[PDB]
Design a binder for this molecule. Structure first.
Ligand SMILES: C[n+]1cn([C@@H]2O[C@H](COP(=O)(O)OP(=O)(O)OP(=O)(O)OC[C@H]3O[C@@H](n4cnc5c(=O)[nH]c(N)nc54)[C@H](O)[C@@H]3O)[C@@H](O)[C@H]2O)c2nc(N)[nH]c(=O)c21
Ligand SMILES: [Zn+2]
Ligand SMILES: [Zn+2]
Lengths: 293, 124
């Protein structure tokens, strides 16, 4: 099985263009667990498979890369995903992580508290979010669009994300946002990626690749989540970590992506084309300053 | 489990946390768990501390902060610079001492001129 050796599954345009009602997500293997290779944390395998798929995307990888990592605390006091980010990113990349409670991490900056307390003074190159609110488990009525931390993440994309930057934001069947789906239309490309290590979950990472700051695709956010659930309900995915058997090319390619300062009026077809190819970032080149407010 | 919080609280009642942890494990105390073991192509150089994983076939690579007693216990680091030597980096550990990553690093020192674990790599 070829798909078992891939890091996971990415939502295809076949289901992006459908028009269906939002249905209940029923996975045939729901809640089934896969043993982790070498007693290693499950978040190791999930983050590595996420990084392996991003290795196939047109990520902008500059010097002094600015990465922010929300929901980085897990497994009672540690941050295995941040360590994977350290293994994946260039050695000169800046990692800022954050979660609600105290934890120990290999990031350059670690901030405790609500994600709203994370004040980003400049613009960043890559946003990873594994945030999930426990109250989402209290399924009472219909599955409606959620605010929660998504309001903060949507404002971050519109204000504190470099042109050409990219995001990877965890969603589930009930942890999702209309506004965030519609923001994917402001990137050069988008998808939802589901790791094979956690294929038994409705969890997926909403990916926006290369931020353009302008609407490229008009997306109905509510209808697109229904398409996401329709895809999960239609697509067998077997638990697997086979993609981690060969890690000879795991590290993010040292692309040396240039960082340029441009006025909005100066952004033309060439700039948009370079941004869409992962060949350019537009933001400040000050010194990154992200503190607790 | 709750045993990690037990030994992590114990090194808060001492003036020498390194010897406190080492005396605890040497007397049969439960080794500290939940260290962040990485998955690596075991084709690395083998040095003690590295910016990227450098495990040999006889090594395992851990996230540096998770194997540092002072990071895990949230106590002051003893380094004169005040900078942890493991945090933000990766620490290679012999495969036979995987049962207790924290106590190994507290029990050994990388070679100054050579950067390999003395007795576990250093050939000077
Ligand atoms: C998909 N599904 C949902 N239900 C029903 O809908 C509810 C809400 O789902 P919900 O959106 O959490 O999604 P799932 O439980 O996948 O999330 P899953 O727990 O994987 O969560 C995904 C991620 O959540 C993260 N997360 C969940 N709990 C917490 C938490 O307490 N704290 C933090 N910080 N993160 C959490 C967790 O790490 C995991 O990776 C479910 O609880 C069921 O009642 C299903 N029922 C059946 N029979 N079959 C199904 O396939 C099925
Ligand atoms: Zn430390
Ligand atoms: Zn030596």
């Amino acid at each position: 099985a070829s798909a078992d050796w891939k890091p996971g599954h990415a939502m295809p345009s076949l289901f992006k263009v459908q028009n269906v009602n939002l249905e209940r997500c029923e996975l045939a293997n729901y809640k089934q667990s896969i043993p982790m290779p070498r007693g290693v944390h499950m978040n190791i395998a999930k983050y590595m498979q996420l990084c392996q798929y991003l290795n196939t995307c047109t990520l902008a990888v500059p010097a002094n890369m600015r990465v922010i990592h929300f929901g980085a605390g897990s497994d009672k006091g540690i941050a295995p995903g941040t360590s994977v980010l350290r293994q994946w990113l260039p050695t000169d990349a800046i990692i800022i992580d954050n979660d609600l409670n105290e934890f120990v991490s290999d990031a350059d900056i670690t901030l405790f508290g609500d994600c709203v307390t994370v004040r980003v003074g400049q613009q960043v190159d890559l946003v990873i979010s594994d945030m999930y609110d426990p109250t989402t488990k209290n399924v009472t009525g219909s599955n409606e669009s959620k605010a929660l931390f998504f309001t903060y993440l949507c404002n971050l994309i519109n204000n504190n994300l470099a042109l050409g930057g990219s995001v990877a934001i965890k969603i589930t069947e009930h942890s999702w946002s209309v506004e965030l789906y519609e923001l994917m239309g402001k990137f050069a490309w988008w998808t939802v990626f589901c790791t094979n290590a956690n294929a038994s979950s409705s969890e997926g990472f909403l990916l926006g690749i290369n931020y353009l700051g302008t609407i490229k695709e008009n997306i109905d956010g509510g209808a697109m989540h229904a398409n996401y659930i329709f895809w999960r309900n239609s697509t067998p995915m077997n638990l697997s970590t086979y993609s981690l058997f060969d890690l000879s090319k795991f590290q993010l390619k040292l692309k040396g992506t240039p960082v340029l300062q441009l006025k909005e009026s100066q952004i033309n077809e060439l700039v948009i084309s370079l941004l869409s190819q992962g060949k350019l970032l537009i933001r400040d080149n000050d010194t990154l300053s992200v503190s607790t407010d | 489990f709750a045993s990690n919080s037990s030994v992590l609280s114990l090194v808060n009642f001492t003036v020498d946390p390194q010897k406190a942890y080492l005396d605890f494990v040497n007397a049969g105390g439960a080794p500290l768990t939940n260290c962040v073991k990485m998955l690596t192509p075991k084709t690395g150089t083998g040095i003690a501390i590295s910016v990227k994983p450098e495990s040999t076939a006889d090594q395992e690579t851990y996230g540096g902060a998770s194997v540092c007693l002072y990071c895990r216990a949230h106590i002051e680091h003893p380094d004169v610079s005040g900078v942890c030597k493991y945090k933000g980096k990766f620490v290679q550990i012999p495969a036979q001492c995987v049962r207790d990553p924290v106590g190994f690093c507290l029990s050994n020192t990388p070679c100054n001129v050579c950067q390999y674990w003395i007795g576990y790599g250093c050939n000077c």
